[PDB]
Design a protein around this ligand. Sequence first.
Ligand SMILES: C=C1C[C@@H]2CC[C@@]34C[C@H]5O[C@H]6[C@@H](O3)[C@H]3O[C@H](CC[C@@H]3O[C@H]6[C@H]5O4)CC(=O)C[C@@H]3[C@@H](OC)[C@@H](C[C@H](O)CN)O[C@H]3C[C@H]3O[C@@H](CC[C@@H]1O2)C[C@@H](C)C3=C
Ligand SMILES: Nc1nc2c(ncn2[C@@H]2O[C@H](COP(=O)(O)OP(=O)(O)OP(=O)(O)O)[C@@H](O)[C@H]2O)c(=O)[nH]1
Ligand SMILES: Nc1nc2c(ncn2[C@@H]2O[C@H](COP(=O)(O)OP(=O)(O)O)[C@@H](O)[C@H]2O)c(=O)[nH]1
Ligand SMILES: [Ca+2]
Ligand SMILES: [Ca+2]
Ligand SMILES: [Mg+2]
Lengths: 424, 440, 67
Amino acid sequence: MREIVHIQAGQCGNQIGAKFWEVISDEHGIDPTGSYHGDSDLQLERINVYYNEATGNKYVPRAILVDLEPGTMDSVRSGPFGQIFRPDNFVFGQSGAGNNWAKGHYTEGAELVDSVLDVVRKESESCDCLQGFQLTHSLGGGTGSGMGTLLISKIREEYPDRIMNTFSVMPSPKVSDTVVEPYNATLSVHQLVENTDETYCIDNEALYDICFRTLKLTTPTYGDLNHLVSATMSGVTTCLRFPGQLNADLRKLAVNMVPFPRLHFFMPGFAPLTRALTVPELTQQMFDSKNMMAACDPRHGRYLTVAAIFRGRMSMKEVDEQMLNVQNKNSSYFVEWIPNNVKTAVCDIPPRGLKMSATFIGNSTAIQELFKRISEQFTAMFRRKAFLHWYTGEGMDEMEFTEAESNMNDLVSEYQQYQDATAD
Amino acid sequence: MRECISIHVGQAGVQIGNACWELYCLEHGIQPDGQMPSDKTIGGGDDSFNTFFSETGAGKHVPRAVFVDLEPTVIDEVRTGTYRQLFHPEQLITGKEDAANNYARGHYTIGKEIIDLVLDRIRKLADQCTGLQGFLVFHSFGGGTGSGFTSLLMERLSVDYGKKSKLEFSIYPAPQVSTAVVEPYNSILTTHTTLEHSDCAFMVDNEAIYDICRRNLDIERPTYTNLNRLISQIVSSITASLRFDGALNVDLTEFQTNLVPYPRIHFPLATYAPVISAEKAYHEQLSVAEITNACFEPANQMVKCDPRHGKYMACCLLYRGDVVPKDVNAAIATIKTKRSIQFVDWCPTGFKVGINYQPPTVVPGGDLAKVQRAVCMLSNTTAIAEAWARLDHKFDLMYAKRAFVHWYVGEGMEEGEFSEAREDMAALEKDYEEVGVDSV
Amino acid sequence: KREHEREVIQKAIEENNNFIKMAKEKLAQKMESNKENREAHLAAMLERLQEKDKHAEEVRKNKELKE
Ligand SMILES: C=C1C[C@@H]2CC[C@@]34C[C@H]5O[C@H]6[C@@H](O3)[C@H]3O[C@H](CC[C@@H]3O[C@H]6[C@H]5O4)CC(=O)C[C@@H]3[C@@H](OC)[C@@H](C[C@H](O)CN)O[C@H]3C[C@H]3O[C@@H](CC[C@@H]1O2)C[C@@H](C)C3=C
Ligand SMILES: Nc1nc2c(ncn2[C@@H]2O[C@H](COP(=O)(O)OP(=O)(O)OP(=O)(O)O)[C@@H](O)[C@H]2O)c(=O)[nH]1
Ligand SMILES: Nc1nc2c(ncn2[C@@H]2O[C@H](COP(=O)(O)OP(=O)(O)O)[C@@H](O)[C@H]2O)c(=O)[nH]1
Ligand SMILES: [Ca+2]
Ligand SMILES: [Ca+2]
Ligand SMILES: [Mg+2]
């Protein structure tokens, strides 16, 4: 078996993290008590990837819940599938982060990190052959952003040759007005660039726009946004969770998706957004900007690599033809110096509710638009040196803020570089 | 004597091995439990099928084979499958973590942890042989294990068995069923490293096999099962001379003498006919002339290339089934005068012909029609180099930007190994150009 | 002619032994270089992470001093 260790930190981290476990548990046919009652043997084929098998035929999620306050993990324990998590894997403090990245990464977070590492170590030592780690967190808040990135560095120090994967929720003024969020995001991206192998950019700006402008629901809730997030997380992990040939593990995925180490921030997509859709319809929609979970127009850049995942009973001949048709009629948007850079997977088992669906994972240079949006908000405050006493008071100086800013600026320019590169 | 040991490396090599050994058992009347009622000599023998099968005192016939993969899931299917009783547990070797489509991991990081064990198991097979002829190695170009671990094994085998012959069956990558963007890297790397250690290599173009399944068998979206069963028929035709005996039979080593004019020029183009569905073979007897003619139809080749635009250095015809030399010679005469067959001036123009009387067999539930006769053409043509050119071009596109190279460097490799491997491929292309030029 | 016959058989033996020898040496040097390189890359990675730990110390140390 090739196990994955799941970590969720902060409010957003535990929120979308719990939804993830609720969703895939249903797909693999396990109830809130950890018991299996499925109808297909395909459900238990690779269930050890995310679940530990305890005696009594119980399946316990290989998951670690973390936060600097007890509140969030209480609602998790009380929520559905709450009792399925291992009690000792609940690690939380009392102080809190208060939307302060410095407190999460240097102060409060540092005092709790060893306790978390102990749990990670217990889980990792029980693995037949550890794959790596996946982290769910936001970049806007203080705990998930600050302590989350700290946990990545610490884990990477004890597991240097394992794959580090994150599901990062990017901040947006349309959803949260905490104001210091652009700071927490930039400081986080500074960390993610150096210490993650692959990061799914879950953009709250994109999530809101989809709920408002597409799903036509005014005053969307976090339940609505997280519904898209859980649908996305289910899709991008399908190849890891079921029998398959393509991108069946984290490292093979990273090798197909990451041509240069720093360029590992992915644009996820999903179709259809919620008669059933045809394959041509699924295909065209998934490559559409309105179906992107990151607020970036792919036609404003070029694809370095792409991973597509179709789910449900459908014609694989139709899929192959349509995927070929998309690349042919849009050749301009795919870099020519990476031949055959679009890979396709097909899983018979559909997600809940849908007859068939498609999930998009793109490494597009157009992702620079997301960082530019953050960078502009960052510089709007930092040029004034505003609100910096939150961080300087924790021991930080202006040096780190500047370096984080320029490093993210470097990342943007590096995307532009390979976007402008040609074969001749 | 004259035993042959087969080594199946990585998923492609393992699954193709499953197909071949199943086909072998049906051809020789060997049951899934390894028993063979027709074999009266118990515990051993000197029969032709003994080149590929050993025997126990309990009358079991066991494949002279080793299966190896850096992960367990593919070989586990063999361990718990229909032919599980056929193999001794130690013939099936697996690790826990695979090469992740990375030559470096297959040859170095992960490979080095299991290479000694693999060599030990191979040694046990070799010790059972009274006159070991050589090795048949099955593997993909694109996979991390197929590329990386194969190269390591071939190098180690040269050390432990000297110049004892090593033949390759190599799966050439195609976009319709590829799983990694870096397969051109892995392909150039393994071809460079292995080139000095292989005496003869049969490349199988997956795209070529894919198209043949769609066109001739009318399979909308061919699976590995479809491809492998076709590949097995071709592999079977190539080894038929070693496993059977007949008055008109010509050994594979015979064709090999003609097929390899220089050490590095050892990549024969295979072509197989007839490939036809049961629905279309019904009421449709395909004569010697017809299947022979099909061998010169480029659409029936194992590798996509145009021999009509190259030069021949050798041409071998491997027939099996109801075939007589009279009809073969008549068919060849017609083809010579109606085909684009140009030989280099430094080789003879005759066709090497071998006939095995036992007709082709098919696996139950298969796609191929059971025919009375079949033929496999092995030609040495300069056009095979086109396959190198296509890979080399994809290699150049990515390497000029150093794309994905950090994955290899991170596992201990250097860029110098990339440029060195690519240079060797350049020289190989030149070699194939020079041998084709007319003599001064 | 007897001597030439001995030289040919000896030459065949030598070139086979030399092929084995060269392949053995080339494989040994490749394995060693690859081992050094990969360990050097791990060492560099860990060292960078060590630098972060040291930096975090200077941050917390800088906090208590400012108080
Ligand atoms: C209020 C509340 C209270 C509660 C806050 C929950 C939360 C989650 C955590 O992330 C952080 C955020 O939320 C932070 O939210 C901020 C305070 C700190 C709080 O601080 C943290 C934490 O608090 C408050 C907001 O940003 C609320 C938004 C603000 O749009 C800018 C307002 C219009 C504005 O008044 C005009 N200028 O419409 C609201 C639009 C959003 O409503 C929410 C529901 C209402 C919202 O649930 C659903 C999302 C999916 C959304 C679409
Ligand atoms: N014809 C055929 N090709 C296959 C088969 N399995 C894999 N391939 C091809 O082999 C290439 C991928 O290499 P694999 O053999 O699957 O990988 P591997 O040797 O197991 O190495 P790693 O998994 O990376 O450790 C792709 O080009 C596939 O199309 C098969 O069963 N039949
Ligand atoms: N999509 C989504 N975003 C969230 C959720 N909870 C918080 N966020 C976002 O996360 C940011 C605040 O981070 P938060 O998790 O509350 O702080 P933390 O507890 O210190 O990690 C805000 O920009 C919110 O928009 C959630 O359940 N779903
Ligand atoms: Ca016998
Ligand atoms: Ca049809
Ligand atoms: Mg494999």
